[PDB]
Amino acid sequence: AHPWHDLEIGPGAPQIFNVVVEITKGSKVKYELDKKTGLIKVDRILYSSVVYPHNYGFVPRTLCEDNDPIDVLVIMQEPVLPGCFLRARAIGLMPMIDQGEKDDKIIAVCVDDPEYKHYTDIKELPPHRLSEIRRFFEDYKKNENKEVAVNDFLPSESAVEAIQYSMDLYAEYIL
Amino acid sequence: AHPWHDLEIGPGAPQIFNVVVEITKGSKVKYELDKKTGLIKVDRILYSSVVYPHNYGFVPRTLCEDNDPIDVLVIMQEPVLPGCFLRARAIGLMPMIDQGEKDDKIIAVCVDDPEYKHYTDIKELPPHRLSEIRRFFEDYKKNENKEVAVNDFLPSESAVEAIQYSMDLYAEYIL
Amino acid sequence: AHPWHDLEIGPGAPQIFNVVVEITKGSKVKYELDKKTGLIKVDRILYSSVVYPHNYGFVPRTLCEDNDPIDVLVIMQEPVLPGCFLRARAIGLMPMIDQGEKDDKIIAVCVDDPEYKHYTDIKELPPHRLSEIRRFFEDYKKNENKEVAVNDFLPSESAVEAIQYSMDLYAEYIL
Ligand code: NA
Ligand code: NA
Ligand code: NA
C-alpha cells in the first residue's frame, strides 16, 4: 500500500486520524514521503544543531496548498519510526509562513498513548511545550537563509477545520 | 510485497522460517502489522515501564485463532528494525491465555546470528532467559487491567507443530 | 514501489543518483535488499565486533557481476534508516575481491548534507577516513573464514564509469 493514497484516513476523521510518521522525535534528518514511490527519502540533514521536538508526519488522503498532505506534529511518550503510522487526535493548530507561503502544522496527540490520549486541546499542555515547538519552526531553516514566520497557536477546532478542508481538497484531486 | 501474504515462509518451514519483525528488543512501542495495508502501525505505547525482551514479530503465510499470523520472539545479539525480516528456527513454545483467549508464542533463534544459530531447544538457554520472558508477558498488560496467564514452556517439537498447524490454517483461508 | 526496480535512478545519473540505504552507520546487522520482495532482510549479524563505518546501500536500476545492484558507502553527518533513500554523488571507487570475485564499492556523499555536499573527490577527505573504510572491508568477514582483498582507492571518474556500466547492464537485463 502507498501510505498517502492507499492507507485510509480512519473512521474518526477529521477529529481522529491516522498519521504516517516521517520524522522521529530527536532527529536531525529531515525525511519526507516521496510522493511518486511512497518510499521515505532524505530531503536534507538540518543546517543547524537542532532536532525535531516531536514525531512528525502527514495525514493520508489529505492535500494542502503546497500540494502535499497536511503536516502533523504528534506529542507522545516515545519515538516512532519513519514509515509507520499511528492514530492521533488534533488538539491545536500552528499557523506559519515559510518563504511567503502558507504552511500550517497540526498539533496532535496519539490516542493510543496512555499518557497523552486524554488531551483535547493545547491549552492543557505545559506552556513550555508550545514555546519550544514554535521556536523549532522559527529556527530550523534559519541556517539555510530561509525566513520562517510562526503565528499564535489556535484551538483544537481550528485544526479539525484544517484537516476537513484538506480531506475535501484531496477528494477533488483524486480523478 | 505485502509482508504477510507475499513473503514466502521459507523452504525450511516448519522448522526454519522467515520472521517479519514488528517490535525491536528494548522497545516500549507495541507496533503491529496492519493486516489490510501491510504497513507497520502503533497499536499502543505499553502502559507499564516495561520493554520487549527480544525482537518480536510474526511468520508470513500463517494463521491462528486470533485471526493473526503466529507470533514469534526471536532471541539474538542485536536489535532488528520493524518491517525487516530474518530467518529463524523454532526452539520452544510458550503457551498463554490473554483475556480468556489462546495466544501462544514461539520462542526462536536467528539462524544467521553466529552466537545463537546453533541452539536447537530452549533447555540450552540460561534458565533466567525463560524466566524473564514469562514475566514480561505476565506483566506487560497488567496496567491495562487485562489478565494474562502464562503456562510452562514446551519443547522445540511443540513449536514446530504449532507452526505447521498455522501454515495449514492459512492455506485453507486463502481462497 | 519496489526499491530496486520502481525507484528512478535520478535525473543526474551517473554523477548524482538515488541510493537506497540497507545498513545504517554503526550497525553490526548486515541487512540487505531481498530482491524478490523488495523488503529489507537480515542477511546476518557480523561475526566480528565491527560496525559499518558509514551508511551503506545500493543504486536503483543498476546491476553488477554478482547479479545485485551496485554497492555504495555514503559518507555524511547522520545515520539513515534501512529502506529509506537519499541523493548522493560518487566521489571515489574502492576495488575489492571477495572470495575470488569482483565486488567494488562506490564511495559517495549525500548532496543534501550541508557538511559533505561540496565534496567532489576522495582526495579531499581526511586520509584516515579512507584508511578506516579499507580496513573495515578487510576485517568484516575475517571471522567467517572468508578472504577479502581490497586494492588502492580510485578517483571520482572511475566511480562514475562503474555506475554507468551498471546502468547499462541493468537496461540490458530488463526484458
Ligand atoms: Na507541508
Ligand atoms: Na497473536
Ligand atoms: Na555487491
Side-chain angles (χ1 to χ4, degrees):
Chain A
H2 192 300
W4 188 21
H5 304 305
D6 289 332
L7 179 59
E8 72 183 339
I9 183 170
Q15 295 83 19
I16 292 165
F17 47 82
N18 289 328
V19 176
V20 175
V21 169
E22 291 170 308
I23 309 181
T24 310
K25 174 185 207 297
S27 176
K28 193 182 178 185
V29 184
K30 189 180 162 23
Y31 290 111
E32 73 181 3
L33 165 83
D34 185 57
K35 284 180 212 50
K36 181 172 174 119
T37 59
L39 298 176
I40 295 292
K41 75 171 281 175
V42 178
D43 180 51
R44 75 196 98 200
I45 301 316
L46 296 182
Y47 282 49
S48 282
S49 199
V50 297
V51 300
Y52 275 78
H54 295 290
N55 296 317
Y56 182 87
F58 70 82
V59 181
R61 315 189 161 181
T62 66
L63 183 62
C64 303
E65 285 187 15
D66 62 8
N67 296 276
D68 297 343
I70 191 158
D71 318 317
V72 189
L73 210 58
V74 182
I75 304 171
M76 41 196 299
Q77 294 193 62
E78 295 287 319
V80 167
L81 288 153
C84 297
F85 75 97
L86 56 83
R87 309 193 290 178
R89 170 190 307 110
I91 62 162
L93 173 68
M94 190 187 161
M96 48 183 280
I97 310 306
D98 190 336
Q99 294 157 101
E101 308 280 333
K102 163 169 292 186
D103 194 24
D104 304 346
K105 309 308 180 195
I106 288 159
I107 312 302
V109 290
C110 180
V111 304
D112 294 312
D113 181 347
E115 183 124 24
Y116 292 91
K117 68 176 175 168
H118 69 293
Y119 277 118
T120 55
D121 190 282
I122 43 167
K123 74 183 79 170
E124 300 177 84
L125 295 169
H128 188 68
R129 246 320 80 224
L130 299 180
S131 177
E132 189 183 66
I133 292 169
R134 170 170 203 141
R135 189 64 74 184
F136 172 78
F137 289 99
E138 298 174 335
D139 281 356
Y140 81 134
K141 290 193 188 179
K142 223 156 36 170
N143 224 17
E144 298 182 42
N145 285 26
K146 290 178 185 128
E147 54 174 355
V148 173
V150 168
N151 288 334
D152 279 340
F153 286 94
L154 295 174
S156 68
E157 311 99 81
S158 302
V160 164
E161 282 172 20
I163 289 140
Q164 185 61 57
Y165 216 95
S166 74
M167 301 187 240
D168 299 339
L169 200 65
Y170 183 88
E172 169 69 351
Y173 152 49
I174 297 323
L175 294 170
Chain B
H2 192 300
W4 188 21
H5 304 305
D6 289 332
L7 179 59
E8 72 183 339
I9 183 170
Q15 295 83 19
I16 292 165
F17 47 82
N18 289 328
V19 176
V20 175
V21 169
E22 291 170 308
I23 309 181
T24 310
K25 174 185 207 297
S27 176
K28 193 182 178 185
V29 184
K30 189 180 162 23
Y31 290 111
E32 73 181 3
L33 165 83
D34 185 57
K35 284 180 212 50
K36 181 172 174 119
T37 59
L39 298 176
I40 295 292
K41 75 171 281 175
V42 178
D43 180 51
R44 75 196 98 200
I45 301 316
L46 296 182
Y47 282 49
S48 282
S49 199
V50 297
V51 300
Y52 275 78
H54 295 290
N55 296 317
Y56 182 87
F58 70 82
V59 181
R61 315 189 161 181
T62 66
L63 183 62
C64 303
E65 285 187 15
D66 62 8
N67 296 276
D68 297 343
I70 191 158
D71 318 317
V72 189
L73 210 58
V74 182
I75 304 171
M76 41 196 299
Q77 294 193 62
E78 295 287 319
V80 167
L81 288 153
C84 297
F85 75 97
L86 56 83
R87 309 193 290 178
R89 170 190 307 110
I91 62 162
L93 173 68
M94 190 187 161
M96 48 183 280
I97 310 306
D98 190 336
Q99 294 157 101
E101 308 280 333
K102 163 169 292 186
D103 194 24
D104 304 346
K105 309 308 180 195
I106 288 159
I107 312 302
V109 290
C110 180
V111 304
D112 294 312
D113 181 347
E115 183 124 24
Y116 292 91
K117 68 176 175 168
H118 69 293
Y119 277 118
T120 55
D121 190 282
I122 43 167
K123 74 183 79 170
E124 300 177 84
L125 295 169
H128 188 68
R129 246 320 80 224
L130 299 180
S131 177
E132 189 183 66
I133 292 169
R134 170 170 203 141
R135 189 64 74 184
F136 172 78
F137 289 99
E138 298 174 335
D139 281 356
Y140 81 134
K141 290 193 188 179
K142 223 156 36 170
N143 224 17
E144 298 182 42
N145 285 26
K146 290 178 185 128
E147 54 174 355
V148 173
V150 168
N151 288 334
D152 279 340
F153 286 94
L154 295 174
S156 68
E157 311 99 81
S158 302
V160 164
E161 282 172 20
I163 289 140
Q164 185 61 57
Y165 216 95
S166 74
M167 301 187 240
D168 299 339
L169 200 65
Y170 183 88
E172 169 69 351
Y173 152 49
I174 297 323
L175 294 170
Chain C
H2 192 300
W4 188 21
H5 304 305
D6 289 332
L7 179 59
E8 72 183 339
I9 183 170
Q15 295 83 19
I16 292 165
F17 47 82
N18 289 328
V19 176
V20 175
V21 169
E22 291 170 308
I23 309 181
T24 310
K25 174 185 207 297
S27 176
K28 193 182 178 185
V29 184
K30 189 180 162 23
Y31 290 111
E32 73 181 3
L33 165 83
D34 185 57
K35 284 180 212 50
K36 181 172 174 119
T37 59
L39 298 176
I40 295 292
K41 75 171 281 175
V42 178
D43 180 51
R44 75 196 98 200
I45 301 316
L46 296 182
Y47 282 49
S48 282
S49 199
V50 297
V51 300
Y52 275 78
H54 295 290
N55 296 317
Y56 182 87
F58 70 82
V59 181
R61 315 189 161 181
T62 66
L63 183 62
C64 303
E65 285 187 15
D66 62 8
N67 296 276
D68 297 343
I70 191 158
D71 318 317
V72 189
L73 210 58
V74 182
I75 304 171
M76 41 196 299
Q77 294 193 62
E78 295 287 319
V80 167
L81 288 153
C84 297
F85 75 97
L86 56 83
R87 309 193 290 178
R89 170 190 307 110
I91 62 162
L93 173 68
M94 190 187 161
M96 48 183 280
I97 310 306
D98 190 336
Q99 294 158 101
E101 308 280 333
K102 163 169 292 186
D103 194 24
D104 304 346
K105 309 308 180 195
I106 288 159
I107 312 302
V109 290
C110 180
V111 304
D112 294 312
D113 181 347
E115 183 124 24
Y116 292 91
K117 68 176 175 168
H118 69 293
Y119 277 118
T120 55
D121 190 282
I122 43 167
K123 74 183 79 170
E124 300 177 84
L125 295 169
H128 188 68
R129 246 320 80 224
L130 299 180
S131 177
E132 189 183 66
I133 292 169
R134 170 170 203 141
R135 189 64 74 184
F136 172 78
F137 289 99
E138 298 174 335
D139 281 356
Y140 81 134
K141 290 193 188 179
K142 223 156 36 170
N143 224 17
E144 298 182 42
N145 285 26
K146 290 178 185 128
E147 54 174 355
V148 173
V150 168
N151 288 334
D152 279 340
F153 286 94
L154 295 174
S156 68
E157 311 99 81
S158 302
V160 164
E161 282 172 20
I163 289 140
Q164 185 61 57
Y165 216 95
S166 74
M167 301 187 240
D168 299 339
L169 200 65
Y170 183 88
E172 169 69 351
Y173 152 49
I174 297 323
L175 294 170

